[PDB]
Amino acid sequence: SFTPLVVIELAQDVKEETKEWLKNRIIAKKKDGGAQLLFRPLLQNLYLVGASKIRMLLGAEAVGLVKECNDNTMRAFTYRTRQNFKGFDDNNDDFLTMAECQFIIKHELENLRAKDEKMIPGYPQAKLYPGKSLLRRLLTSGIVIQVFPLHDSEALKKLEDTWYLKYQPIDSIRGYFGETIALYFGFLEYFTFALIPMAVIGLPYYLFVWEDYDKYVIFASFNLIWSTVILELWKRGCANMTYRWGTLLMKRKFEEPRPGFHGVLGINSITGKEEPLYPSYKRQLRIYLVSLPFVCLCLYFSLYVMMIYFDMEVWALGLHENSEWTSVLLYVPSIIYAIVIEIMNRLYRYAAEFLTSWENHRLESAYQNHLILKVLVFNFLNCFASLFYIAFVLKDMKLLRQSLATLLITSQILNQIMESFLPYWLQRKHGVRVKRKVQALKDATLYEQVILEKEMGTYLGTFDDYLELFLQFGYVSLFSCVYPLAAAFAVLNNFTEVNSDALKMCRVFKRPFSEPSANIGVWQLAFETMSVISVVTNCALIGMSPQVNAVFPESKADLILIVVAVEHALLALKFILAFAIPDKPRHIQMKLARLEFESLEALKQQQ
Amino acid sequence: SFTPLVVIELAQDVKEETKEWLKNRIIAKKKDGGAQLLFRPLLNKYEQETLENQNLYLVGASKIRMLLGAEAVGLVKECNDNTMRAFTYRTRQNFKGFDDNNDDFLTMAECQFIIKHELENLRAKDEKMIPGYPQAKLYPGKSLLRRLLTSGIVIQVFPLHDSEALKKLEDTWYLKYQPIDSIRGYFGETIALYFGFLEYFTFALIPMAVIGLPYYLFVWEDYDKYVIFASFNLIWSTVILELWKRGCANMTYRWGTLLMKRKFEEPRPGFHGVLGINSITGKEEPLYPSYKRQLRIYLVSLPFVCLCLYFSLYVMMIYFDMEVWALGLHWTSVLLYVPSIIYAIVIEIMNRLYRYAAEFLTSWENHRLESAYQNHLILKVLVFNFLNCFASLFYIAFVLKDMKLLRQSLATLLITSQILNQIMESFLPYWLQRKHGVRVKRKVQALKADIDATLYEQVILEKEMGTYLGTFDDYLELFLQFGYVSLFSCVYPLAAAFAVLNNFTEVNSDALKMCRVFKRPFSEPSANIGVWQLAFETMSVISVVTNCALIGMSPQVNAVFPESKADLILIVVAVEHALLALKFILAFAIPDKPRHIQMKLARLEFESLEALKQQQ
């Protein structure tokens, strides 16, 4: 037997013909086609996958893992140059982490492609063709229910005590969960600290009720500078961290395609690998002619539904004006609309997940960036369109404050209960349920660990987690002049968000597969667009204030021209400030430059 | 003993001690410090008995030395497997068109660039001054060519023209497609890139010239008709600047200059610093802290540019106050032209003074690469030149709201000003250079020398010829053209029509200028139009504000909003914001490089990583 790292669960009554065929492709040497891994049953069609120490190192070279050398330079790992890497020893096995090991096994299983097989053996309906990903076809047909990495109980407990006042152990989170999860907790810790100045500046604006032109201009000016500087400083900080990790030096563009990518099997022009080939023009037409108009239709429908709610609030007001039964009827449109939004968010996410898969993206990073962008513009509109309507159409600041107060207090408390506190309570209960199933079996230590983690919840991704902080940044940068405590409640929620999300990662969901991320992805553009919208918002809210309108009693045209001029000047200064601040620090830029120079000198020597 | 390529002219009475020292650095092997080139006077000791040397010296190099110098600068040439790779003397056989029996592998322009590069990287070792001139002090690492030019010991350094090659290019240059690859072979990537952009921009303006033509002819002054033209204008602005990026990428890849990593190149002769080892390249060159350069940029240079920009607006206001005093006075018909004549003269005094101050500050900023010095200098001079040109135009259009005066202002700029510009730019300097040329040839024939003074006459002629200042003044013409077209096409519909007409003669006027006016300019391997891309893109961003304002200002739109002028502005500003977002999305959607170039650049990026894994 070996050390079990990844588990594969097959459907209730899968044919032996299929099971043995799957075993062969996971065991057979790469020369004969198929991953050179180890396969063994749990003893429920649950199977354990591992690999040799030498096989793992060869797999680490294949994915291109960047590790620190003895000369303190970060280089991509090679089995021939294994001795030059810092912390390496042939007597050791602790060179690659369990998270790295499980990622390599996932990568090899994802790149398992059909050779001469015209279908999955035993299942003629589950057809195959040369180049088609086996893992994808197995998951699509339903022969393979799920593939997941195993938790290291002892390691997870050690991290837990260091995770949940102090600085978060981002390097420890990286070692166990990966670059993508650690980057989220890295951004969460940063954003919480970033919001602190805005929370302290905004605090006396509420306490002493500061409603002056000069006082609002000072706060909004600081807000617009803060928005740019924090998003620029994040880029520099992230560049430092990812360089230290080695994921920044990784050339992810030359990586093998995702299992969901289909195409005619051929030779890649760049890498020279035998993989599926798909024309970019076919993907582009699906993006701009089918997907883009659909997103615009859902965005228009979101505004149409929102208008129905604001028309329903009018009918509910008139009925109360025409007293026990009417007071209940006033809450009814707010309850209906919030429910319709949840029905819309779950339906649009299914349609978005379908279209991004149908678009046929080659890399997982591309699929993620396009999917995030679709779901995000929808989630942003359904959340802020009503907020913009109350603020600039209805011009009711009392209702806007009450709207933001519900979003920042009551909604965030309920979110934490639904996000981790309730699922943790229910997972503790499932812990007993699994323990009883194993007692019926009568050494079932690993058996209990697999049965528990198999039935555990699957972590969907960092989207819902980042969206919370994106919407937070939305309320803070946009309406801080209306609701000065916006950043104060954002920091307070984020103080428990770190503890709650950590609990959600450790004791709720099963171990998620690590992804070597070098940044927050398309979220940088999303957050920067929010800081651009905040210029329009802050200039409009100040221009709308009766203190400014007192100076312009008749000439309202002049006032708007002044506001628009100031807005244009600020947008130019905001661009200049972002351009002036370099996205990478000097020392990282030099370290990246000398390695770029070395690659060119290497190419001259090789040719 | 060799083929002369570059000429070095020394001051009237330079000491022999200085001359022999300069000769030694230019001849001595690179191992002992100094370029391994060949140095010889214009006239040999026997020829010097018939005619004076005038302290003129010819520089050349060996065929093998030139190839080693081509590797040093990192010239990218096409291989036998059709891949573009940087030249290496060990891998010389793998490059397409290479032969040991030949010498026509590297062009004369490439050869002269390599010699210039070696002379620029000539640095002082133990010498505490230029021998014979104690005032011209030296320190370890200081560029000799820079100190020689600063002190005035070396008057100038310039490449020699190839008369026969220039005449062959002239006949193929001056309806047809411009020979950009032929211009590249003689003048270089920078000069050919300008003519490449000129040819492109002229074709790009043609749709706008044809669309705008019936707007003038039939006097189309409708809301729908102006919105259609302005909508087309804003789409055109983005698409042409995006398609240029793609076209330039194709051209610079074919040339090989796109595959050049210019960031690792040796510093410009004007760059000073403490001699040390470079952290990236490992070369012994001057080192200067970036923070010192940054402080000079944001604390001294940036406030100065802002002061000159404020003064430009202040001087403009005095002109618009002078035109009020002239309108009230109306001998009077002559007095009306007087304030316009005064302001235009003050503009010229301001543009020549600001350019001296800008050239000083960009040199003082101490930029390491020539490309950086150029981009910062262009940016300073351009914002000033743009403001003086357009601030008065914006004032007439949006403050005075006089469209009749704006049309007449644009008509002078696009017709009379462009005709006069062509006379001053090439036609008059050509006439004056031709007159001098005939006079030099007739002077030498009168001597009847007992020596062959063919090369002597060629050097004396090209030495006294005008020096080409750079592509700035040439690109600025097209930038200002793009300015009048993208911004005020709704007011002046013939803007693009007169722009194309001028550009039809501009190609021939600038070709005559480069062939028969200025002496051969040193080639610079450029991979793009530089900071001009940002300049042109900013102009297309300003055109959204301009077109939205001019339409919103029209009485047809104001007829719909008689009292609610606040509502009208809010609609205009909303439309402007929506268009600016769509303009950004369109630019983001169009990839700056074509698919085939991106793949060719990717496989070469992959090869470099595979090479680093094999080497380590």
Ligand SMILES: CCCCCCCC/C=C/CCCCCC(=O)OC[C@H](O)CO
């Ligand atoms: C990381 C922690 C950062 C902590 C930072 C310190 C917070 C002190 C509060 C400042 C509010 C703004 C008060 C200044 C603006 C203000 O009131 O100006 C009106 C004029 O005085 C009217 O003339």
Ligand SMILES: CCCCCCCC/C=C/CCCCCC(=O)OC[C@H](O)CO
């Ligand atoms: C005698 C003909 C001379 C040759 C001239 C060639 C001009 C080619 C292009 C013109 C664009 C015209 C755009 C017109 C705008 C347009 O279609 O407007 C809709 C309705 O006219 C609104 O009422």
Ligand SMILES: CCCCCCCC/C=C\CCCCCC(=O)OC[C@H](O)CO
């Ligand atoms: C009356 C109002 C109706 C409003 C209707 C909507 C108009 C478009 C709005 C915003 C631009 C959003 C652009 C984002 C598109 C987006 O997410 O594209 C990802 C790709 O589709 C992935 O393949």
Ligand SMILES: CCCCCCCC/C=C\CCCCCC(=O)OC[C@H](O)CO
């Ligand atoms: C002081 C007043 C200055 C007034 C000047 C306007 C400033 C507008 C603000 C930001 C630029 C946003 C640019 C968005 C469009 C954009 O990114 O376009 C890409 C290419 O330019 C397309 O060709």
Ligand SMILES: [Ca+2]
């Ligand atoms: Ca939460």
Ligand SMILES: [Ca+2]
């Ligand atoms: Ca969360």
Ligand SMILES: [Ca+2]
């Ligand atoms: Ca930046």
Ligand SMILES: [Ca+2]
């Ligand atoms: Ca001209």
Ligand SMILES: [Ca+2]
């Ligand atoms: Ca010109």
Ligand SMILES: [Ca+2]
């Ligand atoms: Ca008004």
Ligand SMILES: [Ca+2]
């Ligand atoms: Ca582009």
